[PDB]
Amino acid sequence: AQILPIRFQEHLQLQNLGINPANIGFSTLTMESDKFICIREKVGEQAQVVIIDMNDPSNPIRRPISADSAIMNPASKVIALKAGKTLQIFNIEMKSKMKAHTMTDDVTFWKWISLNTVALVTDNAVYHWSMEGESQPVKMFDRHSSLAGCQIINYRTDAKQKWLLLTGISAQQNRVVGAMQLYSVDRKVSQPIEGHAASFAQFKMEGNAEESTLFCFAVRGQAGGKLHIIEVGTPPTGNQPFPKKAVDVFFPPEAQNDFPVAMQISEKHDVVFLITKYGYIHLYDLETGTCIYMNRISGETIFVTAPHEATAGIIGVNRKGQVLSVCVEEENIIPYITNVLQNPDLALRMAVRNNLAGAEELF
Numbered sequence: 001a002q003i004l005p006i007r008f009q010e011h012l013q014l015q016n017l018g019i020n021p022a023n024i025g026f027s028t029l030t031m032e033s034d035k036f037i038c039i040r041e042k043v044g045e046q047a048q049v050v051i052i053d054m055n056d057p058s059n060p061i062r063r064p065i066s067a068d069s070a071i072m073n074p075a076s077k078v079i080a081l082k083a084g085k086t087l088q089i090f091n092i093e094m095k096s097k098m099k100a101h102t103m104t105d106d107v108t109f110w111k112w113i114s115l116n117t118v119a120l121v122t123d124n125a126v127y128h129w130s131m132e133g134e135s136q137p138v139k140m141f142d143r144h145s146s147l148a149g150c151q152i153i154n155y156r157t158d159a160k161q162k163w164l165l166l167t168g169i170s171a172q173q174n175r176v177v178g179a180m181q182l183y184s185v186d187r188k189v190s191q192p193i194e195g196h197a198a199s200f201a202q203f204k205m206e207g208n209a210e211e212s213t214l215f216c217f218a219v220r221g222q223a224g225g226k227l228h229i230i231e232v233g234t235p236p237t238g239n240q241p242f243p244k245k246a247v248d249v250f251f252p253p254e255a256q257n258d259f260p261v262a263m264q265i266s267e268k269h270d271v272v273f274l275i276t277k278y279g280y281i282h283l284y285d286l287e288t289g290t291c292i293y294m295n296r297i298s299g300e301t302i303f304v305t306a307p308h309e310a311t312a313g314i315i316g317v318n319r320k321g322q323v324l325s326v327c328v329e330e331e332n333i334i335p336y337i338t339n340v341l342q343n344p345d346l347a348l349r350m351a352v353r354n355n356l357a358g359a360e361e362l363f
């Protein structure tokens, strides 16, 4: 068989839209959802910000805007801008300031965690800040000492905002070591975890009426590459617990310095997408951890990812400016699982879930 369980797509080449490759990187380019990319560029002496609307990519909007960091809202024409310790949320459509706040501590990382809330990470704490109303940032938890001095690379929550996860990395010798802090809002407890990339997911087990809240993380530490899928906290009333899964994360012999950097989980397909530093993608079944597919999909590091809503896939930007995505190929995944993976248990479970499109309708 020459069929794949995935479809790879190239959506854009940012260098073809007038972006300097020097600005295609984590400190200057943000992609908080699949709807926009925002780039900060200094051209001559002038600070400029560029917004690429992914529905209208050939018409980037570029303006002289001074900001140390810029993150578009996941859905609205709303942008958060930082300069020093002062933060602003700005309504672009209405050319009007929504909210502003001056922090005491420097915000070293920030990210939209929902359609209306931005998370703020300082050296010692994490806050949530609504874009609505008058409310100021609210401290969610204090940072755990295991993340001290890390470079923060991600912050994310489960859908219900009851489980909060901060992820950093640090250099030790010639290694890149991942440190995570998982915080339970209900329990007011943190747990340190050695991890490089992670995501949450909602999964409805066979036999259960209510979805389980799953936490998936991957790491490459002293025991090698490992992926874990675990239910966090107490199951919903009436549910059976999700049995913890643990599987190997493979790296080939020529990739001893590769490690996980990003994860997204398909809401529709119950598949984990894992991206590595060297530009590999792995697919894993969320229920079992079974590895479905691995391949190198990018010749450059992919430094930012988001869910790709249209395909329930993953979209990312690599360092040369290729905007790429991977999703399940809904017609070919079960054939691939049947004849290449030769995993009929998975083939059957996937068909029973019945979340793969088949046979086009008339409207």
Ligand SMILES: O=C1N=C(NS(=O)(=O)c2cccc3ccccc23)S/C1=C\c1ccccc1Oc1ccccc1
Binding pocket: 049, 050, 051, 061, 062, 063, 064, 065, 079, 090, 091, 092, 095, 096, 097
């Ligand atoms: O020059 C301008 N270009 C704008 N484009 S945008 O699409 O709304 C727009 C807004 C925010 C971020 C953007 C990033 C990339 C591309 C366009 C952006 S808003 C604007 C000036 C402005 C408008 C309202 C209130 C204040 C404004 O600036 C001032 C700053 C300091 C002091 C006085 C004014």
